[PDB]
Amino acid sequence: AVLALSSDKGLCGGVNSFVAKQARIVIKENEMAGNAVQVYGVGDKIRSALQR
Amino acid sequence: SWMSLAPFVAPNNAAAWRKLRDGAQEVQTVIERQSTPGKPQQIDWAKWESQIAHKDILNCLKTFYTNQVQILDRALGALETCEGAEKGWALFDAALSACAKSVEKSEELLSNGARALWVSCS
Amino acid sequence: DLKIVAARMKSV
Amino acid sequence: VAATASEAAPLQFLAPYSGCAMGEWFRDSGRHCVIIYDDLSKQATAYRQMSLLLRRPPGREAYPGDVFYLHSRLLERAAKMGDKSGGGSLTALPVIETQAGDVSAYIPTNVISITDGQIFLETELFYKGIRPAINVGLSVSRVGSAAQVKAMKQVAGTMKLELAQYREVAAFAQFGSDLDASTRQLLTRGTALTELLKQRQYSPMKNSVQVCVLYCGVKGYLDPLDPKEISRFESLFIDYINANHQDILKTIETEKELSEKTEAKLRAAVDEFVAMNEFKK
Amino acid sequence: MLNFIPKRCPSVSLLFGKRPVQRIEVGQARHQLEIPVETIEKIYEGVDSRLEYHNKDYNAMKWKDFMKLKLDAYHLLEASQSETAAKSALSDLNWFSDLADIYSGQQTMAEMDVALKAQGEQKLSYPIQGKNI
Amino acid sequence: GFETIHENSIKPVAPLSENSKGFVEFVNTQLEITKAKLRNARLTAFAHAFV
Amino acid sequence: SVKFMDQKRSGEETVYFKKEDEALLRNLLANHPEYDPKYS
Amino acid sequence: MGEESVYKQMKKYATDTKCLDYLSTFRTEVEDQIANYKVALVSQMRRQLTER
């Protein structure tokens, strides 16, 4: 279970960008070995970043 | 009324149905077209006999025209009053019998369902 | 033109 | 009526009046007509050229002042006559090329100020994928629904409303925010309609077929479907209704309305079509 | 449902066959349904009168007929629950080909009973250079 | 500029199922028996215009 | 930048006040039953 | 639930008797559409001759 903390407003630089980058890295690393991943999040920015 | 028989078609009996449909559509597209204006052509040789100077082949052409139009109206009034078709009307009657049998057993099914509902409610 | 540049300057 | 560039200035200056003269025969003789002036700015160029070589003094943008009386004479010949003068008509569809989208100029302003509507065309919409690239916000028609079939009124009112809402909301929506379903439906329907109104060149369609297609688009038989699939949904539905349901089209062409019978028949045909076919959603 | 058919005697079911129709309320919404009394009377041919239950006001059907009825109900129910259910209770229809064939046949037979009449062709008058001109 | 019917614009039947063969065949046979006859009644005229 | 800001503003306001109007339509008839035609 | 399901499925199939009445008309109609087809074919031939 990956808990990604983020914000709800924009103009925050690229902090949510780096967060979602690390989260993508972790997910793609842990889904190869076969570990079933779940995603919890805080803020709409991570949702918009990882939806598609 | 037989044109509302579509939804009882199946995909195994689709192309045939479509063929029949297009046939009838062709027929009607003929008929309405060739009976909507009626007769607006009705050419008048008084104009062309004057407007043309030869008047030697025009005469034979007009003779041909009135000789073909005579036989056309003749055939028309003649048809405007067998066995070759009964050999297919027998197939049609067999189809009607099969359809009635299918409707009969389906009505039996629905009657049994209604009987079940009556029994349950009573 | 002028209207475009003036509106842009105002907004910015 | 070809008054090309090698053709002298007076011929370029006379060609649209010659076209109106050829059209007044139809307008007066009980018949109808349409006239398309293409490159109506070259007429004003030629008038400028003539007046400047005749030593007449210019105005603004080196044009004379008689440009309004150059276009008014021409466009006031378009008209719809009464039942005593035959009942004819002469429609007009002038064409204008702007530069950098500048419609604050002189000739565009005059012609917009002396016409019963506008059809704007943009390159941003032409390259985004919307072809014809008609901006339906700026584009108007003062006549409006009176020049529209009832069957088309019913659909096009809703269509205009939905497209207004979509145009309002999509700009904010594109920033990656997360919206409710009542707004997601607006975006979906607007995208569907925007993908419906695209057309190939030299591929026009009948009014009944437009009505049927926009019915499919307005009643929600394209919302779940993918945007990229509508370009073939449209053609397959067109072929389907042209093949097996010409009678509905003839009925719409004759009655020029949508009774409940035709409504139900069209809905059933669309349902049959979606059953018979499969798309990406 | 149960195998309890009410006796149609008036001491039990007053006014059974006085009119040609029966009515019932169905489900929680209590939808109305009208049924012909003959469709209902078909049951009393399968009814067995040796068996009488519930104050001797209900007879029992024979198990064959009762289970046929149950199976029809069950089939309708599972068809309702399934998605690939047939859109009709009709069997394989196979008489659209014969209809198409006879339609094409009548069309052709008319088309070629026309040109027997429309081509009498008594004689023609061809203009020929040198002679007719 | 004469207008004569082109007989070959008529088209015979396409069989669909076996049960129709006893009709279709009688059709197509009679169709030939009319097509050749009509052909003759055409060309005889075409000849007897030219003697 | 101009049409950009204008359309973004219009969409945001539309969404916000659509939500607020939905809420007010929910909570109207309770606090103002004199309009509610249920009692008329 | 059983009563409702059976009721609605019978409503779905109530329409299955109209197949037979439609079929009967077929023989009555086509033996008139053909007599009103030969006429139109005659007139087609007349029109084509005149136009030629």
XYZ file of C-alpha atoms in Angstrom:
743
model
C 0.000 0.000 0.000
C 1.530 3.279 -1.179
C 0.356 6.399 0.661
C 1.216 9.434 -1.469
C 0.871 12.816 0.227
C 0.196 15.851 -1.949
C -1.657 19.171 -2.056
C -4.962 20.433 -3.442
C -3.902 23.833 -4.839
C -1.599 24.480 -7.774
C 1.407 26.753 -8.216
C 3.290 24.504 -5.771
C 6.370 24.179 -7.972
C 7.039 20.551 -8.821
C 6.716 18.894 -5.441
C 3.700 16.812 -6.416
C 5.540 16.057 -9.656
C 8.457 14.582 -7.705
C 6.052 12.745 -5.390
C 4.214 11.128 -8.303
C 7.563 10.338 -9.937
C 8.775 8.453 -6.863
C 5.380 6.742 -6.631
C 5.536 5.624 -10.269
C 9.055 4.312 -9.649
C 7.936 2.356 -6.584
C 4.857 0.933 -8.313
C 6.751 -0.154 -11.428
C 9.464 -1.698 -9.246
C 7.080 -3.598 -6.955
C 4.683 -4.828 -9.664
C 7.452 -6.718 -11.485
C 8.147 -9.121 -8.613
C 4.382 -9.676 -8.393
C 3.426 -7.710 -5.276
C -0.157 -6.503 -5.646
C -0.107 -2.738 -5.139
C -2.805 -0.461 -3.747
C -2.679 3.329 -3.833
C -3.881 5.737 -1.169
C -3.465 9.447 -1.755
C -3.968 12.877 -0.247
C -4.922 15.728 -2.564
C -6.407 16.000 -6.043
C -3.020 16.602 -7.671
C -1.785 13.025 -7.217
C -5.154 11.807 -8.498
C -4.895 13.920 -11.645
C -1.271 12.817 -12.053
C -1.856 9.059 -11.762
C -5.439 8.569 -13.006
C -4.799 7.700 -16.648
C -48.814 -5.222 -43.048
C -46.149 -7.851 -43.730
C -43.463 -5.139 -43.742
C -43.503 -4.975 -39.925
C -42.196 -8.563 -39.772
C -38.596 -7.463 -39.144
C -37.874 -8.190 -35.454
C -38.927 -11.827 -35.878
C -35.914 -12.224 -38.182
C -32.738 -14.006 -37.096
C -29.171 -13.482 -38.359
C -29.328 -16.859 -40.113
C -32.368 -15.538 -42.028
C -31.172 -11.949 -42.403
C -29.723 -11.628 -45.909
C -32.758 -13.331 -47.477
C -35.067 -10.911 -45.656
C -32.958 -7.945 -46.757
C -33.068 -9.179 -50.361
C -36.866 -9.394 -50.234
C -37.034 -5.946 -48.638
C -34.817 -4.318 -51.262
C -36.837 -6.010 -53.997
C -40.066 -4.499 -52.718
C -38.333 -1.149 -52.217
C -37.149 -1.226 -55.836
C -40.691 -2.011 -56.965
C -42.207 0.875 -55.014
C -39.473 3.292 -56.127
C -40.451 2.354 -59.665
C -44.173 2.665 -59.175
C -44.453 5.934 -57.256
C -42.001 7.553 -59.676
C -43.866 6.369 -62.783
C -47.236 7.403 -61.394
C -46.515 10.750 -59.701
C -46.266 13.103 -62.724
C -48.675 10.989 -64.783
C -48.056 12.176 -68.346
C -46.144 15.470 -68.782
C -44.207 14.409 -71.910
C -46.944 14.100 -74.550
C -44.808 15.437 -77.396
C -46.485 17.626 -80.030
C -45.330 17.146 -83.622
C -46.903 20.440 -84.740
C -43.847 22.206 -83.316
C -41.199 19.977 -84.880
C -42.788 19.629 -88.325
C -42.457 23.413 -88.558
C -39.088 23.814 -86.828
C -37.464 21.149 -89.047
C -36.843 21.439 -92.782
C -36.201 17.818 -93.800
C -39.612 16.327 -92.953
C -38.684 13.011 -94.605
C -37.283 10.949 -91.728
C -39.312 12.838 -89.110
C -42.445 11.340 -90.673
C -41.255 7.733 -90.434
C -39.974 8.362 -86.905
C -43.388 9.710 -85.866
C -44.992 6.674 -87.513
C -42.758 4.392 -85.444
C -43.700 6.362 -82.328
C -47.456 6.080 -82.870
C -47.051 2.416 -83.844
C -45.251 1.570 -80.633
C -47.574 3.687 -78.493
C -50.577 1.868 -79.973
C -49.237 -1.529 -78.918
C -48.168 -0.154 -75.529
C -51.659 1.112 -74.716
C -52.995 -2.152 -76.166
C -50.948 -4.292 -73.776
C -51.863 -1.918 -70.945
C -55.604 -2.247 -71.502
C -55.148 -5.980 -72.036
C -53.427 -6.565 -68.693
C -55.934 -4.166 -67.089
C -58.590 -6.903 -66.874
C -53.124 -20.080 -63.616
C -50.574 -22.666 -62.469
C -47.095 -21.126 -62.755
C -47.321 -19.539 -59.293
C -49.170 -22.150 -57.213
C -45.943 -24.179 -57.064
C -44.582 -21.465 -54.756
C -47.818 -20.573 -53.029
C -47.679 -24.138 -51.708
C -44.339 -23.273 -50.096
C -45.981 -20.137 -48.721
C -48.846 -22.138 -47.209
C -46.372 -24.583 -45.661
C -44.564 -21.611 -44.138
C -47.870 -20.329 -42.789
C -48.551 -23.718 -41.208
C -45.121 -23.772 -39.567
C -45.580 -20.228 -38.281
C -48.983 -21.093 -36.836
C -47.482 -24.129 -35.102
C -44.681 -22.028 -33.603
C -47.168 -19.397 -32.444
C -49.271 -22.212 -30.998
C -46.507 -23.672 -28.857
C -45.336 -20.210 -27.768
C -48.910 -19.423 -26.739
C -48.884 -22.705 -24.829
C -45.762 -21.539 -23.001
C -47.246 -18.155 -22.120
C -50.532 -19.786 -21.113
C -48.631 -22.063 -18.751
C -46.889 -19.015 -17.321
C -50.220 -17.276 -16.780
C -51.564 -20.452 -15.182
C -48.567 -20.500 -12.857
C -49.202 -16.893 -11.866
C -52.886 -17.621 -11.266
C -52.042 -20.645 -9.126
C -49.476 -18.686 -7.132
C -51.795 -15.739 -6.512
C -54.662 -18.070 -5.579
C -2.051 46.117 -33.376
C -2.470 48.279 -30.261
C -5.543 46.929 -28.452
C -3.948 43.473 -28.255
C -0.678 44.678 -26.757
C -2.447 47.017 -24.334
C -4.802 44.304 -23.070
C -1.862 41.912 -22.714
C 0.136 44.488 -20.745
C -2.852 45.158 -18.480
C -3.433 41.466 -17.781
C 0.242 40.730 -17.150
C -18.074 34.593 -63.849
C -14.261 34.632 -63.868
C -12.585 38.039 -63.518
C -9.055 36.837 -62.810
C -5.904 38.816 -62.056
C -4.692 39.197 -65.637
C -8.206 40.427 -66.421
C -8.282 44.196 -66.131
C -9.425 46.193 -63.128
C -12.764 47.238 -64.696
C -13.655 43.607 -65.395
C -12.831 42.677 -61.804
C -14.917 45.695 -60.750
C -17.871 44.678 -62.941
C -17.980 40.914 -62.382
C -20.137 40.858 -59.200
C -22.616 43.331 -60.690
C -22.776 41.114 -63.777
C -23.529 38.167 -61.507
C -26.303 40.085 -59.767
C -27.676 41.019 -63.194
C -27.707 37.349 -64.199
C -29.417 36.501 -60.905
C -32.122 39.155 -61.130
C -33.582 37.187 -64.047
C -34.247 34.343 -61.605
C -35.291 36.704 -58.809
C -37.855 38.441 -61.036
C -39.069 35.416 -63.026
C -40.495 33.546 -60.030
C -37.414 31.327 -59.706
C -34.742 31.136 -57.003
C -30.993 31.636 -57.085
C -27.811 31.791 -55.038
C -24.721 33.880 -55.817
C -21.244 33.441 -54.317
C -18.864 36.390 -54.590
C -15.370 34.954 -54.060
C -12.603 37.387 -53.082
C -14.890 40.363 -52.547
C -11.835 42.326 -51.372
C -10.321 42.253 -54.859
C -13.327 44.308 -55.970
C -12.339 47.025 -53.499
C -8.707 46.690 -54.570
C -9.795 47.284 -58.171
C -11.922 50.283 -57.186
C -8.955 51.767 -55.310
C -6.778 51.143 -58.377
C -9.262 52.777 -60.749
C -9.847 55.858 -58.582
C -6.111 56.308 -57.992
C -5.301 56.070 -61.682
C -8.212 58.431 -62.374
C -6.578 60.839 -59.886
C -9.530 60.661 -57.507
C -8.451 61.360 -53.924
C -8.311 58.480 -51.438
C -9.718 57.928 -47.967
C -8.421 55.572 -45.287
C -6.296 52.565 -46.242
C -6.039 54.415 -49.588
C -9.614 53.396 -50.410
C -12.194 55.952 -51.556
C -15.272 56.847 -49.532
C -17.691 55.223 -51.986
C -16.883 51.677 -50.811
C -20.052 51.569 -48.726
C -22.012 52.643 -51.807
C -19.984 50.033 -53.726
C -21.174 47.159 -51.553
C -24.660 48.452 -50.704
C -25.752 48.662 -54.345
C -24.513 45.099 -54.776
C -25.907 43.403 -51.664
C -29.273 45.207 -51.651
C -30.095 43.375 -54.892
C -30.378 40.159 -52.891
C -34.001 39.964 -51.808
C -37.078 37.800 -51.308
C -39.931 39.056 -53.473
C -43.638 38.837 -52.748
C -46.347 36.659 -54.231
C -47.272 39.439 -56.685
C -43.737 39.772 -58.100
C -43.497 36.017 -58.689
C -42.197 34.799 -55.349
C -38.554 34.537 -56.375
C -35.456 34.973 -54.260
C -31.784 35.903 -54.492
C -29.589 34.676 -51.648
C -26.098 36.088 -51.149
C -22.999 34.478 -49.642
C -20.116 36.955 -49.832
C -16.625 35.813 -48.874
C -13.898 37.767 -47.086
C -10.250 37.089 -46.259
C -8.971 38.837 -43.133
C -5.324 39.290 -42.150
C -4.217 38.103 -38.701
C -7.895 37.754 -37.828
C -8.236 41.548 -37.861
C -11.966 42.190 -38.278
C -11.528 45.717 -36.891
C -10.560 46.785 -40.426
C -12.664 48.826 -42.860
C -13.938 46.362 -45.481
C -14.722 43.533 -43.034
C -16.476 46.043 -40.772
C -18.607 47.434 -43.611
C -19.607 44.006 -44.848
C -20.375 42.704 -41.375
C -22.451 45.840 -40.773
C -24.481 45.254 -43.941
C -25.222 41.519 -43.677
C -27.798 39.370 -41.882
C -25.258 37.107 -40.195
C -21.687 35.895 -40.023
C -19.769 32.635 -40.454
C -16.288 33.024 -38.970
C -13.512 30.588 -39.869
C -10.288 30.112 -37.915
C -6.928 28.446 -38.421
C -6.611 27.371 -34.795
C -9.821 25.384 -35.265
C -8.739 24.317 -38.753
C -5.555 22.715 -37.384
C -6.959 21.456 -34.068
C -9.043 19.020 -36.140
C -12.329 20.923 -36.604
C -13.075 20.961 -40.338
C -15.102 22.997 -41.305
C -13.474 25.298 -38.743
C -16.621 27.300 -37.991
C -16.623 29.220 -34.706
C -20.267 28.971 -33.629
C -19.907 31.671 -30.977
C -18.996 34.581 -33.218
C -20.956 33.083 -36.116
C -24.605 34.165 -36.076
C -27.664 34.430 -38.311
C -30.199 37.149 -37.509
C -32.887 35.283 -39.459
C -32.204 32.165 -37.426
C -34.851 29.545 -36.778
C -37.258 31.032 -39.328
C -34.786 29.713 -41.923
C -34.753 26.298 -40.213
C -36.874 23.160 -40.366
C -38.833 22.257 -37.238
C -37.165 18.839 -37.114
C -33.856 20.712 -37.109
C -35.071 23.331 -34.616
C -35.847 20.623 -32.058
C -32.304 19.256 -32.130
C -30.328 22.420 -32.833
C -31.665 24.403 -29.881
C -30.418 21.744 -27.474
C -27.202 21.438 -29.485
C -26.478 25.165 -29.275
C -27.184 25.172 -25.535
C -24.905 22.187 -24.897
C -22.117 23.646 -27.026
C -22.390 26.974 -25.199
C -21.977 25.174 -21.876
C -19.079 23.069 -23.174
C -17.329 26.151 -24.562
C -17.758 27.842 -21.188
C -16.446 24.941 -19.123
C -13.811 23.156 -21.211
C -11.125 25.808 -20.743
C -11.236 25.411 -16.966
C -11.663 21.646 -17.325
C -8.445 21.183 -19.304
C -6.283 22.056 -16.267
C -6.624 18.562 -14.798
C -9.167 19.345 -12.088
C -11.651 16.690 -10.962
C -15.306 17.436 -11.649
C -18.713 15.982 -10.880
C -20.755 13.844 -13.248
C -23.186 16.611 -14.192
C -20.200 18.506 -15.631
C -18.418 15.445 -17.011
C -21.615 14.824 -18.989
C -21.409 18.353 -20.395
C -17.812 17.778 -21.475
C -18.617 14.369 -22.969
C -21.618 15.623 -24.944
C -19.721 18.683 -26.153
C -16.813 16.548 -27.343
C -19.262 14.197 -29.068
C -20.978 17.052 -30.899
C -17.663 18.692 -31.829
C -16.570 15.351 -33.307
C -19.924 15.003 -35.075
C -19.855 18.378 -36.821
C -16.620 17.521 -38.656
C -16.929 16.746 -42.352
C -14.831 15.779 -45.350
C -14.474 18.078 -48.340
C -17.043 17.626 -51.114
C -19.019 15.259 -48.846
C -22.306 17.055 -48.130
C -25.314 15.370 -46.559
C -29.087 15.582 -46.797
C -31.179 17.343 -44.179
C -32.942 14.186 -43.006
C -29.576 12.469 -42.543
C -28.234 15.460 -40.618
C -31.351 15.286 -38.429
C -30.863 11.572 -37.758
C -27.160 11.945 -36.966
C -27.700 14.880 -34.619
C -30.515 12.926 -32.960
C -28.056 10.112 -32.277
C -25.644 12.722 -30.937
C -28.129 14.615 -28.778
C -30.085 11.757 -27.178
C -26.869 10.250 -25.815
C -25.973 7.406 -28.187
C -22.442 8.840 -28.508
C -21.517 9.911 -24.961
C -19.873 6.624 -23.873
C -18.448 6.050 -27.354
C -14.878 7.138 -28.001
C -14.343 10.508 -29.729
C -12.078 9.022 -32.411
C -14.719 6.422 -33.340
C -17.470 8.900 -34.220
C -15.977 9.468 -37.675
C -16.926 5.877 -38.571
C -20.031 5.654 -36.402
C -21.344 8.474 -38.596
C -20.603 6.765 -41.909
C -21.865 3.340 -40.831
C -25.094 4.857 -39.492
C -25.498 6.841 -42.717
C -25.114 3.705 -44.830
C -27.473 1.799 -42.524
C -30.304 4.325 -42.688
C -29.792 4.943 -46.414
C -30.016 1.199 -47.089
C -32.699 -0.128 -44.752
C -34.592 2.973 -43.554
C -35.087 5.251 -46.549
C -38.782 5.518 -45.660
C -38.004 7.419 -42.453
C -35.895 9.818 -44.510
C -38.662 10.305 -47.073
C -41.135 10.955 -44.256
C -38.855 13.574 -42.709
C -38.278 15.144 -46.130
C -42.027 15.396 -46.739
C -43.530 16.305 -43.360
C -40.501 18.403 -42.302
C -41.085 17.508 -38.652
C -40.554 14.686 -36.152
C -43.811 13.124 -35.019
C -43.724 10.632 -32.158
C -43.970 7.807 -34.698
C -40.808 8.898 -36.504
C -39.139 9.553 -33.143
C -39.814 5.970 -32.049
C -38.824 4.496 -35.416
C -35.531 6.410 -35.403
C -34.768 5.359 -31.827
C -35.479 1.728 -32.721
C -33.246 1.979 -35.792
C -30.400 3.423 -33.713
C -30.833 0.637 -31.158
C -30.722 -1.976 -33.921
C -27.591 -0.299 -35.295
C -25.754 -0.306 -31.967
C -26.778 -3.938 -31.517
C -25.524 -4.932 -34.973
C -22.276 -2.984 -34.521
C -19.476 -2.660 -31.978
C -17.217 0.272 -31.084
C -14.436 0.892 -28.583
C -16.939 1.760 -25.832
C -46.066 -22.005 -6.112
C -48.041 -24.751 -4.374
C -50.144 -27.587 -5.768
C -53.343 -26.210 -4.233
C -56.063 -25.557 -6.832
C -59.230 -23.989 -5.375
C -62.444 -25.897 -5.863
C -64.601 -24.080 -8.395
C -67.787 -24.939 -6.516
C -69.691 -21.825 -5.382
C -69.541 -22.896 -1.730
C -65.773 -22.297 -1.966
C -65.100 -19.942 -4.897
C -68.226 -17.870 -5.338
C -68.722 -16.667 -8.912
C -65.961 -18.629 -10.635
C -67.283 -18.941 -14.179
C -70.027 -16.336 -14.084
C -67.850 -14.147 -16.321
C -65.324 -15.191 -18.987
C -62.260 -13.629 -17.316
C -60.132 -13.920 -14.202
C -57.929 -11.253 -12.645
C -54.973 -11.350 -10.269
C -52.586 -8.991 -8.513
C -48.910 -9.759 -9.048
C -45.859 -8.906 -6.998
C -45.216 -6.234 -4.422
C -46.438 -3.555 -6.835
C -49.560 -5.686 -7.417
C -49.678 -5.400 -11.193
C -52.977 -6.423 -12.750
C -53.264 -9.350 -15.142
C -56.369 -10.725 -16.859
C -56.555 -14.388 -17.845
C -59.190 -16.265 -19.881
C -61.353 -18.636 -17.895
C -60.694 -21.328 -20.517
C -56.948 -21.054 -20.004
C -57.744 -21.506 -16.321
C -60.201 -24.373 -16.888
C -57.424 -26.291 -18.621
C -56.033 -26.923 -15.115
C -59.150 -28.701 -13.867
C -58.545 -31.473 -16.391
C -55.306 -32.285 -14.561
C -56.825 -31.730 -11.140
C -57.183 -34.892 -9.042
C -60.288 -35.042 -6.859
C -59.187 -37.817 -4.487
C -56.861 -35.281 -2.854
C -58.390 -32.380 -0.938
C -56.567 -30.091 1.469
C -56.967 -26.923 3.531
C -60.493 -27.465 4.858
C -61.284 -29.534 1.752
C -61.358 -26.361 -0.329
C -58.303 -27.097 -2.496
C -57.604 -30.075 -4.724
C -54.234 -31.154 -6.096
C -53.024 -31.453 -9.655
C -51.212 -34.451 -11.029
C -47.476 -34.132 -10.596
C -46.747 -34.355 -14.323
C -48.872 -31.309 -15.150
C -47.831 -29.391 -12.039
C -44.140 -29.864 -12.808
C -44.597 -28.919 -16.455
C -46.161 -25.688 -15.184
C -43.298 -25.179 -12.721
C -40.734 -25.748 -15.480
C -42.372 -23.160 -17.713
C -42.234 -20.673 -14.837
C -38.592 -21.525 -14.111
C -37.612 -21.179 -17.765
C -39.232 -17.755 -18.009
C -37.513 -16.699 -14.783
C -34.025 -17.794 -15.811
C -34.542 -16.184 -19.218
C -35.400 -12.963 -17.390
C -32.239 -13.305 -15.313
C -30.003 -14.056 -18.306
C -28.816 -11.578 -20.932
C -28.466 -13.873 -23.968
C -32.141 -14.821 -23.719
C -34.054 -15.138 -26.968
C -36.051 -12.068 -27.958
C -38.963 -14.386 -28.794
C -40.427 -17.732 -27.763
C -40.542 -18.880 -31.393
C -38.431 -21.726 -32.738
C -36.011 -21.654 -35.668
C -37.788 -19.785 -38.455
C -36.722 -21.057 -41.871
C -39.353 -19.760 -44.330
C -37.851 -16.392 -45.282
C -35.860 -17.968 -48.111
C -38.956 -19.369 -49.794
C -40.661 -15.979 -49.497
C -37.680 -14.245 -51.100
C -37.574 -16.849 -53.873
C -41.272 -16.537 -54.698
C -41.025 -12.743 -54.608
C -38.165 -12.742 -57.113
C -40.074 -15.316 -59.153
C -43.252 -13.247 -59.345
C -41.209 -10.140 -60.159
C -39.427 -11.878 -63.040
C -42.622 -13.557 -64.264
C -44.289 -10.145 -64.486
C -41.251 -8.562 -66.145
C -41.330 -11.290 -68.824
C -45.104 -11.449 -69.167
C -44.871 -7.762 -70.074
C -42.511 -7.986 -73.037
C -44.649 -10.686 -74.663
C -47.279 -7.972 -75.125
C -45.033 -4.928 -75.503
C -43.053 -6.459 -78.420
C -45.620 -7.412 -81.028
C -43.401 -5.599 -83.541
C -45.544 -5.752 -86.663
C -43.039 -3.960 -88.911
C -40.568 -1.081 -88.839
C -39.684 1.831 -91.134
C -35.930 2.385 -91.275
C -34.700 5.429 -93.247
C -31.865 4.281 -95.513
C -29.580 6.502 -97.563
C -30.285 6.532 -101.290
C -33.724 4.893 -101.045
C -35.883 6.296 -98.230
C -34.403 9.808 -98.424
C -33.171 6.905 -81.885
C -35.565 3.976 -81.569
C -36.152 2.532 -78.097
C -36.308 -1.270 -78.015
C -36.361 -3.303 -74.809
C -33.048 -4.999 -74.056
C -34.219 -8.472 -73.053
C -31.025 -9.212 -71.145
C -31.962 -6.521 -68.627
C -34.271 -9.193 -67.236
C -32.446 -11.282 -64.641
C -33.263 -14.873 -63.629
C -33.768 -16.126 -60.078
C -31.027 -16.944 -57.591
C -31.758 -20.181 -55.693
C -31.619 -19.976 -51.904
C -32.824 -23.319 -50.497
C -33.525 -26.717 -52.009
C -37.290 -26.567 -51.429
C -37.558 -23.713 -53.961
C -35.787 -25.560 -56.796
C -39.042 -26.934 -58.209
C -40.258 -23.368 -58.734
C -36.982 -21.673 -59.642
C -36.227 -24.184 -62.408
C -39.673 -23.825 -63.996
C -39.145 -20.071 -63.854
C -35.730 -20.031 -65.482
C -36.697 -22.555 -68.169
C -39.771 -20.510 -69.102
C -37.573 -17.399 -69.012
C -35.265 -18.853 -71.661
C -38.310 -20.018 -73.643
C -39.421 -16.376 -73.653
C -36.008 -14.787 -74.190
C -35.180 -16.700 -77.359
C -38.723 -16.349 -78.712
C -38.663 -12.580 -78.112
C -35.203 -12.437 -79.718
C -36.645 -14.061 -82.843
C -39.670 -11.746 -82.898
C -37.149 -8.893 -82.742
C -34.723 -9.941 -85.444
C -37.429 -11.074 -87.876
C -38.775 -7.509 -87.750
C -35.258 -6.114 -88.135
C -34.884 -8.259 -91.267
C -38.339 -7.590 -92.743
C -37.689 -3.873 -92.553
C -34.692 -4.458 -94.861
C -36.129 -7.277 -97.022
C -3.903 35.095 -21.976
C -7.064 37.195 -22.174
C -9.523 34.620 -23.492
C -7.553 32.099 -21.424
C -8.137 33.937 -18.141
C -11.725 34.848 -19.020
C -12.817 31.321 -19.934
C -11.003 29.746 -16.981
C -12.691 32.221 -14.632
C -16.105 31.636 -16.201
C -15.789 27.860 -15.957
C -14.595 27.920 -12.354
C -17.378 30.275 -11.268
C -19.963 28.233 -13.175
C -18.895 25.000 -11.477
C -18.658 26.510 -7.987
C -22.054 28.188 -8.139
C -23.632 25.162 -9.822
C -22.626 23.172 -6.745
C -23.909 25.908 -4.438
C -27.222 26.143 -6.308
C -27.603 22.366 -6.067
C -27.100 22.573 -2.303
C -29.549 25.461 -1.941
C -32.124 23.596 -4.024
C -31.690 20.667 -1.653
C -32.139 22.778 1.479
C -34.752 25.293 0.265
C -38.134 23.665 0.798
C -37.369 22.633 4.374
C -36.474 26.100 5.637
C -39.164 27.752 3.458
C -42.200 25.450 3.352
C -44.584 28.318 2.552
C -43.398 27.904 -1.047
C -43.549 24.101 -0.969
C -46.628 23.104 -3.028
C -46.813 19.906 -0.976
C -48.761 22.010 1.550
C -51.042 23.621 -1.049
C -39.529 -11.541 -7.028
C -40.438 -14.701 -8.924
C -43.897 -13.420 -9.790
C -42.498 -10.096 -11.000
C -39.828 -11.742 -13.154
C -42.294 -14.121 -14.806
C -44.747 -11.266 -15.378
C -42.220 -8.989 -17.062
C -40.811 -11.775 -19.242
C -44.313 -12.645 -20.420
C -44.883 -8.973 -21.167
C -41.678 -9.132 -23.219
C -43.033 -12.028 -25.289
C -46.691 -10.943 -25.513
C -45.917 -9.539 -28.981
C -45.061 -12.920 -30.521
C -48.535 -13.651 -31.942
C -48.542 -10.783 -34.463
C -46.032 -12.668 -36.615
C -48.814 -14.860 -38.037
C -51.288 -12.123 -39.006
C -48.571 -10.211 -40.860
C -47.613 -13.285 -42.889
C -51.176 -13.796 -44.129
C -51.254 -10.389 -45.833
C -48.188 -11.267 -47.927
C -50.140 -13.315 -50.477
C -52.907 -10.702 -50.620
C -50.556 -7.756 -51.190
C -47.960 -9.002 -53.683
C -50.756 -10.156 -56.024
C -51.726 -6.481 -56.256
C -48.292 -4.839 -56.102
C -47.462 -6.875 -59.206
C -50.520 -5.710 -61.125
C -49.506 -2.194 -60.006
C -45.917 -2.918 -61.099
C -46.495 -4.043 -64.683
C -48.350 -0.765 -65.293
C -45.410 1.288 -64.037
C -43.029 -0.760 -66.185
C -45.136 -0.090 -69.285
C -45.115 3.625 -68.495
C -41.353 3.483 -67.891
C -40.878 2.087 -71.391
C -43.146 4.777 -72.844
C -41.226 7.533 -71.060
C -37.850 6.216 -72.201
C -39.040 6.004 -75.812
C -40.397 9.562 -75.708
C -37.221 10.949 -74.123
C -35.040 9.188 -76.699
